[PDB]
Each structure stands twice: as structure tokens, then as C-alpha cells.
Amino acid sequence: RPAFCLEPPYAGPGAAAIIRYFYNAAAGAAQAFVYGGVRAKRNNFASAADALAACAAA
């Protein structure tokens, strides 16, 4: 599990309201969050599927 998969989700300072996905390692699940459209961190994906493939590979 890459270390970045343990980051809390990071909205950033942007004013957009974009639906993105992060890997919630405690929950064992990819979950939606609101991304502001700028200053993304790595635990930020287009889909649940993308998040799982990077962070819950098995």
C-alpha cells in the first residue's frame, strides 16, 4: 500500500466543488470527497476503482 494512501483527503483552497475519490485505509474503502480544483495531493482519484487499484492492490 503506497504511503500516500494513508493521507487524509485534501480539498485544497479552491472554490470548485469537484467530486473526487480517496482511499480511506481505516474503512478499507474508496470514498467520495469534494475537491476544490487546485493543489491536489496524491490520495485523489477520478473514480473509486482508480483509488482501489492504486491503494488496495491484492
Author numbering: 1001 to 1058
Share the article's original sentences.
We mutated the exposed and partially exposed residues (P8, K15, R17, R39, K41, R42, and D50) to alanines because we expected that these substitutions would minimally affect the densely packed interior of the native protein45. The mutants were named according to the numbers of alanines in their sequences (i.e. BPTI-19A stands for a BPTI variant containing 19 Alanines) and a suffix ‘a’ or ‘b’ was added to distinguish variants containing the same numbers of alanines at different sites45. To provide a structural view of this peculiar instance of enthalpy stabilization, we crystallized and solved the structures of six simplified BPTI variants containing 19, 20, 21, 22, 23, and 24 alanines. On the other hand, despite repeated trials, BPTI variants containing 25–27 alanines merely formed needle crystals, unsuitable for diffraction. All six variants crystallized under the same conditions, indicating a minimal disturbance of the surface properties, even upon multiple alanine substitutions. Seven novel water molecules appeared near residues 10–14 and the Gly14/Val38 pair, forming an elongated hydration network involving water molecules hydrogen-bonded to the backbone atoms of the protein. The R39A substitution also recruited 1–2 new water molecules close to the amide nitrogen of Ala39, extending the hydration networks observed in BPTI-21A. X-ray crystallographic analyses indicated that all of the simplified BPTI structures fully overlapped and that the main change that occurred upon the number of alanines was an increase in the solvent content in the asymmetric units. The new water molecules were recruited around the alanine substitution sites and were involved in novel hydration networks.
